[PDB]
């Protein structure tokens, strides 16, 4: 019979708190980003560079609180974060994404981002179309916050990331998170919403790999132009590539 152990309940509590400590639903800090410009030769690049850089900082903060993550070597923590950062940003952004107008709504017209805004940061439909598809499919899962933070943590602690040294340790940590998620869904998610839910969640991890691949290709092209690179933040340059 499915039963969330005390430990699994503890893992969930820790991750919910970690998320609450690293995701501000008032988006107050957004006022401090370089201003968004919607007229446009990459007019949204400065604002979205800052939104992404900010988000990388928060993902790192969330990652550090994942049970087990601190047990990893510095090298492995770095590899896992560089590879997962954009995917976790895609995942965590689903909180602001709305299917009303298919945009990321962060509390005002200024900080409401649609497909044209993302295009004005340099990205093309090769990435943007499937990204919206992803946000829609993820939103429709109607995840509990418990499942949302578990999925972000499972995403970060992935054994198969390029450059991972101690794959076994990473796998052990992820398995503990996965089993927590699987047990949570069985015990705590009522039907029909729970139907095929874990499988659908794990499929989203596969979708994220493809989005990650395309993002990396487009980031390389965009960051190749020094006049774009001068407008990036140092953290973005370090994590995504310099």
């Amino acid at each position: 019979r499915p039963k969330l152990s005390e430990e699994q309940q503890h893992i969930i509590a820790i991750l919910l708190d970690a998320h609450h400590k690293t995701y501000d639903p008032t988006y107050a800090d957004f006022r401090d980003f370089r201003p968004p410009v919607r007229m446009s030769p990459l007019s949204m690049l400065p604002h979205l560079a800052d939104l992404v850089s900010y988000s990388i900082q928060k993902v790192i903060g969330f990652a550090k609180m994942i049970p087990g993550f601190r047990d990893l070597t510095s090298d492995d923590q770095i590899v896992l974060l560089k590879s997962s950062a954009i995917e976790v940003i895609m995942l965590r952004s689903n909180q602001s994404f709305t299917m009303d107008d298919m945009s990321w709504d962060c509390g005002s017209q200024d900080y409401k981002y649609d497909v044209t805004d993302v295009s004005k940061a340099g990205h093309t439909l090769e990435l943007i179309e499937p990204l919206i598809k992803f946000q829609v499919g993820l939103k429709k899962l109607n995840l509990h916050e418990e499942e949302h933070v578990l999925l972000m943590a499972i995403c970060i602690v992935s054994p198969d990331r390029p450059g991972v040294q101690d794959a076994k340790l990473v796998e052990a940590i992820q398995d503990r998170l996965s089993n927590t998620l699987q047990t949570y869904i069985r015990c705590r998610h009522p039907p029909p919403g729970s139907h095929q839910l874990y499988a659908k969640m794990i499929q989203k991890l596969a979708d994220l790999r493809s989005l990650n691949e395309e993002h990396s290709k487009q980031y390389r092209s965009l960051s190749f132009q020094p006049e774009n690179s001068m407008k990036l933040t140092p953290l973005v340059l370090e994590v995504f590539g310099n």
């Binding site: 790192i60 903060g61 770095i78 140092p234 953290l235 370090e238 994590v239």
Partner: peptide
């Protein structure tokens, strides 16, 4: 590849 800022944020 050396990541000063990432490394510092992880400490």
């Amino acid at each position: 590849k050396n990541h000063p800022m990432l490394m510092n944020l992880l400490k």
